Structure formats: structure tokens, C-alpha cells
Amino acid sequence: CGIWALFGSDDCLSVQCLSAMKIAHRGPDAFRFENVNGYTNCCFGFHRLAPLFGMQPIRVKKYPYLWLCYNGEIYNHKKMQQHFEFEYQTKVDGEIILHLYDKGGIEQTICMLDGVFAFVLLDTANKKVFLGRDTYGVRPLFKAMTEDGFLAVCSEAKGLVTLKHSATPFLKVEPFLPGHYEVLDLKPNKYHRDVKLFPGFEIETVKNNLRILFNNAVKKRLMTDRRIGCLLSGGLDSSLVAATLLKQLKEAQVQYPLQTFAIGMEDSPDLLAARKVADHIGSEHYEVLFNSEEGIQALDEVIFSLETYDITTVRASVGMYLISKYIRKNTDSVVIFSGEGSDELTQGYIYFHKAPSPEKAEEESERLLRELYLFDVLRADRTTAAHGLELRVPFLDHRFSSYYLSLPPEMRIPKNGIEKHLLRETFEDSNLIPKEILWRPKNSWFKILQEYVEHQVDDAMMANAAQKFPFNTPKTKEGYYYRQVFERHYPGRADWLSHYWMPK
Amino acid sequence: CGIWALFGSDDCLSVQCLSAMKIAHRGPDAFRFENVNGYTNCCFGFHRLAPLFGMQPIRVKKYPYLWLCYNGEIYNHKKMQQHFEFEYQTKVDGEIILHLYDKGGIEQTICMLDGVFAFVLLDTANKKVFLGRDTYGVRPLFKAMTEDGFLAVCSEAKGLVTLKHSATPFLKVEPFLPGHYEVLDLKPNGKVASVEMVKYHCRDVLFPGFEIETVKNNLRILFNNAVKKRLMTDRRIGCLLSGGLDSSLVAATLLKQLKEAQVQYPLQTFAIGMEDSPDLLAARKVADHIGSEHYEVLFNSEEGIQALDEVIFSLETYDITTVRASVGMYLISKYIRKNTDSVVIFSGEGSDELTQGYIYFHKAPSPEKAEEESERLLRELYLFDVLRADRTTAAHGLELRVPFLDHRFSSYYLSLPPEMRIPKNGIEKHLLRETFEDSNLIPKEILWRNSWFKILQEYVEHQVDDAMMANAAQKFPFNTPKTKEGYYYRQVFERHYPGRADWLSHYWMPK
């Protein structure tokens, strides 16, 4: 599902459609263009992931002036549909936004939606254009605004770089800040409540709350029509996500068995851990093995899709891209789960042990969560959706994450040299994951890629590098090659990334 | 209202979109692209004129696998919904076709529409593609077929020449023959093969035998019913009062039925002519008699010379009798779109040729030859007369209606014995004049009854000399231009559309 909205375009629309047919890998089944009546300059375009209804440029009979296109999914449409007695003409849940927009405006329609979305709304009655995204950064949105009044919104930045505006030579294609709603006036030519839970912060009665929130998040994420698969990396996060996923699937009476996917190098502890978790839970495990040649040949397309030039979200996105391609090739599991967003929410990184104080620990956790739409969610989203797959994060929801971050700073920090202590303790007695893998906190792929970079980039151009790439100069020979590929693909658009990756 | 289908493609679908926008002037209000699910190679496209309801690529709930895209209006839709007890999810006129296609196949969905229609239908369940056009041809449809399974259908040929197909050097864009429906097999990769193309040529929804004083009553009833049924329109209706008898009667009957139906807006006529021309005076006389809103348009020579290029680009023909009368129609249509808010025009085009209405028809060797010539020239109406009346009108977002070409009236007129249609007392179209003599629809002075081509000839002579005409025999091998005017029109047409001259075969005047 990919959206593309244009407003104020003056260089026709036939020559400006080539950008739209570049995010088409998000949904390869359907495709639709539209023009806002009376606003021929404005145009809409959608790509759908697979029979009759589902075309995103919604224009209902009750609200003829509301044109909404959203490339996400909201998990709380049933509750408000029953509670607010709202009738939906179509089968798409996103219409509820319209049924809320006429109710209390944009603040009420954006702040009462459980799920991940990125929506563009046009209201000709009051002549207003609204743009919206999620609290954390999933379902990416990118906007380009020329001073004259040009508006260009695309799910991925590949649909705006090729856009041509003759008014000004350069258009600034910037990522949309995650938690924000933008309201603009259409000329003729922060919001980061949606709601069992035991009050108090006692240690015994906090595990119940955490488990309830995690189970509710997983059950809410079950809302789909395609198959559900899980990426079984091997760590604690994805292991518990898969365990709870299959438990709810058995509870929900789902015919197809759960399908876990694990990408790894030959004879690695991570792959063995994934196999062990799959064997204990009892799912269908697919053990993808990747070599150096495929990972090297995928660097160009990984950089093209991820739209980044870092050294941490392009060194782990290769495996995710390969496993997504394998899933699309030899599996019908469209909807995919992932444990991403769980090792910074509860301070799971290696460098969180060297913490000057717990206050700085949760401050850094919040800072990392705010900048999650460029480091971790980007890798798990662009690579996944480049193969016609839909990502779901069972850990990064609005309620469980807020409760975890609202907890006392003393509980989140590791206490016995083992990270994620509270998460490990909460589900220890549930027997969801074997004690060998739930406990025991924590492959030669970086070295071979570095040796490839040494044979690709030279040594003299390394010293005289920080004038070819002035902003965010690369340091190592690997980041320089990533930046070179990014510049060859997207020229001069290096302002998307501000800082590479700063562990303390 | 412009349709566009691209069944079969290999050169992406975004570099092949400019052709779709090349015909966007038909309706400049909306424009939708669509890709058929499971057949991402084939793509649709519409350009609608004049709110929420519309978007002609219909996909009804009851027929999820049927995708229809049509240009035109089906006038007998209120007599089919009740009779065939067929519902309608959308307020679109053409949806009825889909229902009929599920009732009696394609033959029963084509020989039951008493209107004008050029439609593309796709049925992915049986993997079939259907094309179609009117019996007479007042709806434009052009098809481009490549053997590898490429079927590109556009309302005007300006939306097919730009289309690019690799693995094939030349793409043949040809007009679709009216009265034909082309069943096509859809291979499971987007390619299209041809299986059938057969002619098809509805009265179930006061008709005595043949005799004088009775045939006139039948003609009166048929013409009145045709105009009344053609009144179905959600926007303003304004007749083109050229000054001739056909347009005069059309406008008079239109005003009578509008007054009968209690329409708030007053009928407005529209005439274009040179200074103090007798045709303009006759049009003013008719407008004064019937009590209408006449907006005469005076067009100068320079405007015609400037609009020659645009009229050749739009009319898509290089005749000497078509782009010589389409200049005035184009200018008047521009005037109507600019300084008036009438979008539906009930022109009298397609009348004289139906009822023996030309100067040479006087010297007919025999009545049988006269009626055969009338039928032949009326069958070829999609290149000479209707083309000028339709392309020029639609180039400014205006719709065309031709009440004289309705199936019932024309069929009855041509079923008449030949000795009644023939000129009788040295006049043209005697029976039509007598059929409305006592109705007082049009005054007796005009019912009972040129310095434009000289500037064109002199401008062509100044532009094109005899040096080019000394080699025009080999410069244009197919349908060589004889006169200088034809030479200049052909040169402009070839500059606009290169090497596509198979559209026209003959010009005029079969003495």
C-alpha cells in the first residue's frame, strides 16, 4: 500500500506520473490515479497490496468533499465503529477517519487511532489539506514543499526525487516527523487518548500489567486477511513475539500454522537459537542461509530501497531484505511480524550497561525511540515492503511502550549484568520460550563486507573525502561506499540522515 | 468523456500515460487510471466532464469481474431498469450494459440500446474483451492492434500514436467500424487475440403501413419522440442554429418539448457566419420566430487561418469538405465554452444525407441508385460529416446530439419506397418539408426554401506553391492531394500525425 499526493503541480501530470510508478513495489496488484474535481492541479495515486473494494482514494456519499488516502492499518476500528455508531459504506477501515473528521476535527481523528498509518486528507468544503503519521515512525511519509505552494507527499522518497517543478530548480524532499499532523490551507490554484491494568508500581503487580499489555498488543495486531508470518531472529524479543503470536493463533482458531523465518550465516548460534525456539513452540521454521555473493550483490538495491547511507541500518538490512525476497518467492505469508523496536524501548543494547545514571538511561531510551524512524524502523519497513510485505511491530504499540516508559527508572535499567531484566522476568513463569533462550543475554559478515569495501574504495580518496560529502562526512571505508552508492542513486539528498549512530 | 484501454503492454505503464492525457480535453474535470487486478499489464483511463458519482470504469458488486468504460449516452435506460427488473448501485447511465451482458450475452447487450455508445468491456471470469460503437457512428473509437497481443483503444487517435510498443516497429492505429462489436480472447498474461468481429446494426420498449398522409404522421411522431428522448441531460441544452432546415426544425421541436417539460433555462441557439451572410439572417429569423436566445458569432478570416492548424489536429482528417466547414464549428464551440454555460448541443448534423439532401442528388440517374447512394454515404458518415461535428464540439468539453440520426426515424425513412425520398418538384428533401408544413414549427420563408474558401485558397497559394505540387504525387503516395487546399491540409496533418493517412480513402462528390 503506497500513496502519492500532489498539490499545486504546474508541469502537467502525465510527465509527473513517473514518480508514482516507483513506489509501486509497495503494492504490485492495483494502481489508481485521480484528479480532485475543481482542482485539476491536485492529483492522487494509490498502489494496493492484494478484490473489488480497497482502492484508497476514498470518497464516500455522506462526505463528498473528503478525499482520504492512507497507507497504514488501524487496529481500533471495531471499537469506535460500535461506540460512535458510525456506518462504513466501504470495507476499508480507514473510512473511520472521515467519520471522526466531521465529528471533532483532526485532533480527535488522529489521537484516537490504535495502529500505524500515514494519511493524506483533502477537504474541499473548508479548503484544507491534512497530513498525518504515527507516534513512532512506521508507515513512512515524505513531503516536498516548494515555496510557491507545491505539495508532494509520497510513502517513500523514491516517488518525489524525480518530480519536476519548473518554478524552482530545487525541491526539498524531507522525511515527515513521526508524531505530527500538518494542516494547510488550500488556495484555489505534535500529538504523541485511545483508552485488567493494576494501579501501582509494585514489582509483583507490574508483571501482570506488562503481560496483559503485550498479549493485547499481539491480539490487536492479528487483524488481517492474509497469512501471518514471524521473523525468528533468535533473541528474546522476537522469540516471545512468535510464542505469543502462535498462542493467540491457536486461541483464535487459525487454520494455517505459524511460519517463522530465520536468516543466518552457516553454522551460527543465532540460527540454532531460532531453530530451538521454533522446535519448542512448534511452528514451521524456514532456515534461510545466505552467502557473501548474494549479500554483496544486494548492497546497491538495499541502499536504493532503504534510502539511507549509515553503517548500522545498512549492515543489518541486507539479511532482512534477503529473507523478505525469499518469503515473497517461496511463501504466501504477506503480513509479517517483527521484534524490532524492543531493544531500545527497554534498554536492550550492549552500551546501556555503561550508564552514568538511570535518568540518563531512560533519557537516551526516549531519544532513541524518537529517532527510530531512521535507524531500526527504516530497515524493518523499507526492506520488508520492497517485496510486497506488510510489517507489524508487536512491541512498539502505543499503550505497552507508554506504560514501560512510565515505569520507575530503577526497574528498566539492567541490575545483574543482564539487559532486559524486567521483560525476562515477566514472562519467565509463562513458559512461552525455553529458559535456555529467554535467559542468557547477548557470524562473520561485517569483516567480509569491510574487505569488499577495501577493494572497492581506495585509500587516497579517504583522506580527501570530507569535501565531496560535506554534510555528515563518512569516516570508515564502508560508510564511504554506502554514501557513494546513495549519492549515485539519490544525488545531493544527504540531508535525510543527521547523525549516523551514537552509542553513548 | 474520453475512454482509454491498454490491453497488453511491456513498456511499463507510466511512460505510456502521456497518450492518455493527450485526449484529456474531452472532459477537463477529472481523470482516473486503473489497473485490472491479476492483469497488471492492461490499464484503463477516463476523462470525465461536469460530482461524487461518475468515474466510468464501473466495477459493480454483483459483477466483480466486469469492468466497463464507455463514452456516450444510452437513452432507453429508464425503459430497461423497470422492464428487466435490474437495479443500479451507481447513478451511471452505462451500467445497464453490464446487467444485459449477464442476461443475453453480448448480442442482447448491443442491439437493445437506443442511444450512442463507444464502450470497452472486460470480463476476467471468461477472459474476454468486448469493443463496440454505434450503428451510425456518433461516438469516436480508435483501435491499435499489435500481433503480440496489444489492443489499445482510445476515443480519439491522438491518444494512440504516442503509445510505444517495443519488439514491433510500427503500431497500426485504425478507426473502429461503427455497428461492430469485437469479441477478443484474453490470454493469461495481458495479451489479446481476436476471435470475432460481426455487424449488429429495440422497439419493444401509431405505426400504420405505407401511404401518403400517413407516412408524414409517422415521421412527425418519430422526430418528436427522438427529440423528447434526446432531452435526457443533467446540464444545459443549446442548439446549433446553422440556418438550414434540419437545424431549424431540430431547434423548434427542442424548444417545444422544453416548454412542455417545464425547463427553467431558455433554449439558446448558436450561429456562426461571415458578415451579413444570408445564413445568419435566416438563423436570426428562425430564432425570432421560435422565441429563443440567439448568440450570433462573426468570425474573421485571420481567426480561421490561425485555427486551421488546431482544427486539423483535432478533426484528425485532411479532406477538403471536412476541414473547410469544421473551422466555423470549432470557433463557435470555443465561443460557447467561453462566453456561455451550455455543454450539450443538439446539432442537426446527419440529416440532409439521410433524406437526399445534396445538390448533386438532383441529378440522380434512378431512384434506386439515389437510395443506394444515400445509404452508402450515410454508412461512411464517420469520416466526413459526423467527424467534423463531433471532434470540434468535444475539443472544448462539449457534447453532441444528432436527433436526425436516431435509429427508429432513420430506419423508417430508409424503409420508405424510393419514389418518395427523391426530389419531386425541383426541391431538396420534399417529404421532410411537407411533414412539418402544417405544424408551424418553422416559418414558411425558411422551411420552404460564400466568401470563406477564397481566403483559404489564397492563404494556401501564398503558403504552398506549385513546386511542392510538382512532386506531391510521390510525397504522399496514398490518397494523393489534387487541389492546393488539400495539399496544405495534408501537409499540416502529416506534420501533426506522421505517416498515418490510411484513415481517409475518398473525399466527396459522386456525381
Numbering used by the authors:
A (entry chain B): 1 to 50, 54 to 192, 202 to 204, 207 to 209, 220 to 466, 478 to 539
B (entry chain A): 1 to 50, 54 to 204, 206 to 209, 221 to 464, 478 to 539
What does the literature reporting this entry say, word for word?
Single-particle images of unmodified, recombinant human ASNS (apo-ASNS) were collected and processed using cryoSPARC62. Data processing (see "Methods") eventually gave rise to a map with 3.5 Å overall resolution. First, two monomers of unmodified human ASNS in the native state form a head-to-head dimer as a result of intermolecular interactions involving residues 31–34 in the adjacent N-terminal domains. The antiparallel orientation of these two peptide segments places the side chains of Arg-32 and Glu-34 in monomer A so that they can form salt bridges with Glu-34 and Arg-32 in monomer B, respectively. Moreover, Phe-31 and Phe-33 in both monomers form a hydrophobic cluster on the other face of the dimerization motif that likely contributes to the stability of the dimer interface in water. Second, the EM and X-ray structures of human ASNS both lack density for residues in two loop segments (residues 201-220 and residues 465-475) and the C-terminal tail (residues 539-560 and 536-560 in the EM and X-ray structures, respectively). As observed for the X-ray structure of DON-modified human ASNS, the intramolecular tunnel in the EM structure adopts a discontinuous, form through which ammonia cannot diffuse. In our overall EM model, Arg-142 adopts a conformation in which the side chain blocks ammonia access to the tunnel, which we therefore designated as closed. In the fifth PC (component 4), the side chain adopts a third conformation, designated as partially open. Closer examination of these structures showed that the carboxylate side chain of Asp-405 formed a salt bridge with Arg-142 when the latter adopted the closed conformation. Based on these findings, we hypothesized that Arg-142 might function as a gate to the ammonia tunnel thereby regulating ammonia translocation between the glutaminase and synthetase active sites.
Here, we use human ASNS, a Class II glutamine-dependent amidotransferase that mediates asparagine biosynthesis, as a model system to evaluate whether EM-derived maps can provide insights into conformational changes that might mediate function in multi-site enzymes. As in all other glutamine-dependent enzymes, catalytic turnover requires that ammonia must move through an intramolecular tunnel connecting the active sites. Human ASNS is also of considerable biomedical interest, having been linked to metastatic progression in breast cancer, sarcoma cell proliferation, and decreased effectiveness of clinical treatments for acute lymphoblastic leukemia. Moreover, ASNS variants are strongly correlated with impaired neural development in children, pointing to the importance of gaining an in-depth understanding of how single residue changes might affect activity by altering the conformational preferences and dynamics of the enzyme.
